[PDB]
Amino acid sequence: MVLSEGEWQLVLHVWAKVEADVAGHGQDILIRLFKSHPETLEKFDRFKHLKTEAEMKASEDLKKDGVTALTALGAILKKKGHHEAELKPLAQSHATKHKIPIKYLEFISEAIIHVLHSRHPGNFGADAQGAMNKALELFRKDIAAKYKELGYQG
């Protein structure tokens, strides 16, 4: 699959707004993920013990991981599909060290779309959401292919 330049522009336009507050979006996205799919929280040994949203909002460790995740995703999106080099180390750590199934990448993709829809209605209309979904689908498809090559695929 391949996105058009127009689709990439819609993706990068809303991402530019996300970059105005990376830490804030990072918290919102991870917390959305953990509330919608509690099982994903078990993968984060640092704060698997958090019980409530209030505790999650106060966690500096969660906020830092959110920034790290979004910054890595932003770098990938900015490559507009030419992200082979960026995906290699990410695929290896998440497949071999963290053991993150593709299902969880789908879950976080859903959280990203939910938060952008909530915080940026003016720049996340139907066409923009479709472009973002297409970009995330491409990311998941390529990461899944790498998982397979690495011996994980799951």
Contact residues: ligand HEM, CB under 6 A: 40, 43-46, 65, 68-69, 72-73, 90, 93-94, 98, 100, 104-105, 108
For ligand HEM, the closer CB: 60 or 122: 60
Could you tell me the end-to-end alpha-carbon distance of the chain, in angstroms, rounded to an integer? 21
Sort residue 125 into left (φ over 0), alpha (ψ -120 to 50) or beta. Answer: beta
Q: How far is the CB of 67 from ligand HEM (least distance, A)?
A: 10
Which residue has the closest beta carbon to ligand HEM?
A: 93
Which ranges of 37-93 does DSSP label H, i.e. alpha helix? 53-58, 60-78, 84-92
The owner of tokens 């998982």 is 147
Nearest to 41 by CA among 67, 59, 68: 59
For ligand HEM, the closer CB: 6 or 32: 32
Distance (Å, rounded) from C-alpha 101 to C-alpha 40? 10
For ligand HEM, the closer CB: 6 or 149: 149
For ligand HEM, the closer CB: 100 or 128: 100
Q: How far is the CB of 87 from ligand HEM (least distance, A)?
A: 10
Q: How far is the CB of 121 from ligand HEM (least distance, A)?
A: 22
Can you spell out the DSSP letters for 89-117? Answer: HHHHIIIIIS---HHHHHHHHHHHHHHHH
Q: How far is the CB of 145 from ligand HEM (least distance, A)?
A: 15
For ligand HEM, the closer CB: 25 or 94: 94
Q: How far is the CB of 106 from ligand HEM (least distance, A)?
A: 9
Nearest to 144 by CA among 90, 108, 97: 90
